[PDB]
Amino acid sequence: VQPQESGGGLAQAGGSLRLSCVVSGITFASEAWGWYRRAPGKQRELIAAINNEGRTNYVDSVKGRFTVSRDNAKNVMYLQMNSLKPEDTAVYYCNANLQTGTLSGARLYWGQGTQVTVSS
Amino acid sequence: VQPQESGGGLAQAGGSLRLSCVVSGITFASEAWGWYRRAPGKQRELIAAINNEGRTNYVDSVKGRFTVSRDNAKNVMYLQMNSLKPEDTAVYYCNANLQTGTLSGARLYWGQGTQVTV
Amino acid sequence: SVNSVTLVGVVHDIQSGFVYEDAVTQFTLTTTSIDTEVVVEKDHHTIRCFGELFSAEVKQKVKEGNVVCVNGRLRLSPQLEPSCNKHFYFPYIQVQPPHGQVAVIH
Amino acid sequence: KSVNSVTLVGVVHDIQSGFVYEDAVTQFTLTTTSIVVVEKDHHTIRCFGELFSAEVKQKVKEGNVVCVNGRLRLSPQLEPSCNKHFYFPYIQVQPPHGQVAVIHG
After folding, report:
1. How far does chain C reach from its first CA to its final CA, in angstroms?
2. Which end of chain D is flanked by fewer CB atoms within 10 Å, N or C?
3. What is the CATH number of the domain that holds C21?
4. Which member of A41, A44, A100 has the closest CB to residue C38?
5. Which secondary structure element, helix H or strand E, spans residue C26, and what is its range?
6. Domain count, chain D
7. Is B64 within 8 Å of chain D by CB?
8. Does C60 contact B at CB distance below 8 Å?
């Protein structure tokens, strides 16, 4: 349960970028994770969230637009990003969604995030 | 649609009985419904809601216990209750839950209800 | 067992209509809450006015995009309908005299 | 200038410590009896603050009747299913704004 993200910086309107969220060491596939984003001014906002297997639920926004995955193999979360709107500028983070939010943690830790920019 | 609860009365602790509900009279299907039981001095508590198709959910206290089903051609709510704890003893109502948030719709009206004692 | 609320902020989506046989007039009250550089948080609260009379006066006097002060009680509705298998709560701020009320500042 | 302020008084329940996305919180439940009809409401109280939460988790015991004095927040959350969007209603408590106080006698 250690955040190790990568990928993202700046791309032309409507691009196609991938993300690598690696859980450093200790078991990962055990939980249900997801990606977030930090707008240049707006606060922390959860977007994509894949189930423990698992059928995924996305925000109205990234619905149909993006699709996140989860591979127990290498312990990595990939966010299939396509048609990257300019309104998709933020620092993206990989982390585990709660259960399903009303639950309390036990340790956890934050990441460092990767900056992403899009302008037509 | 003016509600009309029916079926119920008295059964042993472990006995069984099924309820019913009818409305006059449109439109079913489009509207999802449910059942609300109320204690003597306590508030009404929605038991199970049936979807517009309709799927179904139940209360944490009645999960794997009660079973609700609906018919569109006759606009009827069916609630087969089995092995009834004296806790289930309450005034059961049947009405249409909806919106799951953005409520406030039409006029709405409460049925007289049905009695359940065990 | 005192339950109490006070809110100030922009109004949105004002609507009339009935709760289960009950004249209601709800609306959203977006509140800015600067969390403890460089981001701010908002909070859209469902303000739900009961009492057909108070419900009515509220319905008329409160305009869109306004700024009102809401006193009232905080309620939690079990909700949780089909379409999925899980139970969630509905956080609606109940306003019906002689409980609370709604003053207007914009 | 927005104003989000709640106040509570009632019975406490399920008290436990942990983290909110890696934040030392001590969440619990306050039950105001918002009243023949006795209507109850079980509020969640998330007390943030590395020190504050510990503070609270120790003087606050189950059964205690306490007052709550903090913001009304609501985490969005996107469960495995389904399209139905639901918010998570709790009460962010954290000094100098938040405030907890146990009642005796």
Report:
1. 33
2. C
3. 2.40.50.140
4. A41
5. strand C25-33
6. 1
7. no
8. no
